[PDB]
Write an enzyme that holds these catalytic residues in place. Structure first.
Site, PDB file in Angstrom:
ATOM      1  N   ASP A  35     -58.565  93.936  95.691  1.00  0.00           N
ATOM      2  CA  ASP A  35     -58.640  95.054  94.432  1.00  0.00           C
ATOM      3  C   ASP A  35     -60.183  95.582  94.462  1.00  0.00           C
ATOM      4  OD1 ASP A  35     -59.076  96.248  91.999  1.00  0.00           O
ATOM      5  OD2 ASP A  35     -58.693  94.529  90.767  1.00  0.00           O
ATOM      6  N   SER A 199     -64.909 113.348  94.079  1.00  0.00           N
ATOM      7  CA  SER A 199     -64.325 114.499  95.047  1.00  0.00           C
ATOM      8  C   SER A 199     -64.600 115.937  94.666  1.00  0.00           C
ATOM      9  CB  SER A 199     -62.865 114.208  94.632  1.00  0.00           C
ATOM     10  OG  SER A 199     -61.904 115.169  95.083  1.00  0.00           O
TER      11      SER A 199
HETATM   12  C1  LIG Z   1     -56.067  97.151  87.651  1.00  0.00           C
HETATM   13  N1  LIG Z   1     -56.684  96.374  88.681  1.00  0.00           N
HETATM   14  C2  LIG Z   1     -56.325  94.991  88.773  1.00  0.00           C
HETATM   15  C3  LIG Z   1     -55.562  94.403  88.341  1.00  0.00           C
HETATM   16  C4  LIG Z   1     -54.697  95.246  87.371  1.00  0.00           C
HETATM   17  N2  LIG Z   1     -54.924  96.764  87.023  1.00  0.00           N
HETATM   18  N3  LIG Z   1     -53.489  94.740  86.769  1.00  0.00           N
HETATM   19  C5  LIG Z   1     -53.377  93.421  87.238  1.00  0.00           C
HETATM   20  C6  LIG Z   1     -54.562  93.106  88.125  1.00  0.00           C
END
Ligand SMILES: c1ncc2c(n1)NCC2
Length: 330
Positions: A35, A199
């Site tokens: 992430d 962008s």
């Molecule tokens: C954005 N970034 C990370 C996550 C999410 N959304 N949902 C669960 C883990």
């Protein structure tokens, strides 16, 4: 050093991607969601409330001879979709694709929200944004990339996400066979802790490119592409029958449609997202209304180049002293 690991979509829609990660001694392999929009490495564990575990693989620190409780440290995080988790912290050895970090903070979940429990395929998160966002208290902890970077051949990692197919995260090197043409690099602001860039504009289908600055983040942990309402309206106006549905929570379109591509600018270069990448399937099983992969950021406060955008490119996260982002077609 370098590392290289395959990342695999969790489902037929590419709702997220999981990458195997070795934790502890002997290794416990958990499948984590890498992430670039957050900065905590947290895992389902032997400490997670039992009723909140449903099929995930757990980390058991008591079975790791290299695990050490980080005394007094706790963590708690919430994501843009309303999901959350929290717990305590160990340090342990963590390896990704052959690249090993000792003393990595491994945040052990005591609690996870329902959407985590309900997704048996994701055993935790591995954050790759800047360590200033890490939630550990009272002593903030470093990301896996931050801990590894001094040892890497080059202080970089790359994301090569597949469309309906596996892809690759590489650490410490740029695989020149993995992209076409050249990589266009663009400036990054770390002021919000994200891989935030601007962008240079967009096009819809075969339409003319609109030059306009769009500030947003490269976020492998967000599924969709979230852009200003003006841009998203211009896109969905090219799809007969598409509309924004308050009840569903975004733009939907007839599942019978053929979607146009969407192009975004990186400096003078252009990345083309094929129309099929924007189809997220029926809103509910059997429905002929399909959920769009380009959605408005108006309620979010930031534009997000999530997986829909990033999977169309080979993306370099350059963690040099002045960080930058690179994008290539592939
Ligand atoms: C954005 N970034 C990370 C996550 C999410 N959304 N949902 C669960 C883990």
């Amino acid at each position: 050093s370098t590392g290289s690991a395959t990342t695999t979509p969790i489902d037929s829609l590419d709702d997220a991607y999981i990458t195997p990660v070795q934790i502890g001694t002997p290794a416990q392999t958990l499948n984590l969601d890498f992430d670039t929009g957050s900065s905590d490495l947290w895992v389902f564990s032997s400490e997670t409330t039992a009723s909140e575990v449903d099929g995930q693989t757990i980390y058991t620190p008591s079975k790791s001879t290299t695990a050490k409780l980080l005394s007094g440290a706790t963590w708690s995080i919430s994501y843009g979709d309303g999901s959350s988790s929290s717990g305590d912290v160990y340090t342990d050895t963590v390896s990704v694709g052959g690249l090993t970090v000792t003393g990595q903070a491994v945040e052990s979940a005591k609690k996870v929200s329902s959407s985590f429990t309900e997704d048996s395929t994701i055993d935790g998160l591995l954050g790759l944004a800047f360590s200033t966002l890490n939630t550990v208290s009272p002593t903030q902890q470093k990301t896996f990339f931050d801990n590894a970077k001094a040892s890497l051949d080059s202080p970089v990692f790359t994301a090569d996400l597949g469309y309906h197919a596996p892809g690759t995260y590489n650490f410490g090197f740029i695989d020149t066979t993995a992209y076409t043409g050249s990589i266009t690099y663009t400036a990054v602001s770390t002021k919000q802790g994200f891989w935030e860039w601007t962008s240079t504009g967009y096009a819809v289908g075969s339409g003319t490119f609109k030059s306009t600055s769009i500030d947003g983040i490269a976020d492998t942990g967000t599924t969709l592409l979230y852009l200003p309402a003006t841009v998203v309206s211009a896109y969905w106006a090219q799809v007969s029958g598409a509309k924004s549905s308050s009840s569903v929570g975004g733009y939907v379109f007839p599942c019978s449609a053929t979607l146009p591509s969407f192009t975004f600018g990186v400096g003078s270069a252009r990345i083309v997202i094929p129309g099929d990448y924007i189809d997220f399937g029926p809103i509910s099983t059997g429905s002929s209304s399909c959920f769009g992969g380009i959605q408005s950021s108006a309620g979010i406060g930031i534009n997000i180049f999530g997986d829909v955008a990033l999977k169309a490119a080979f993306v370099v996260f350059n963690g040099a002293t002045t960080p930058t982002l690179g994008f290539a077609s592939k």
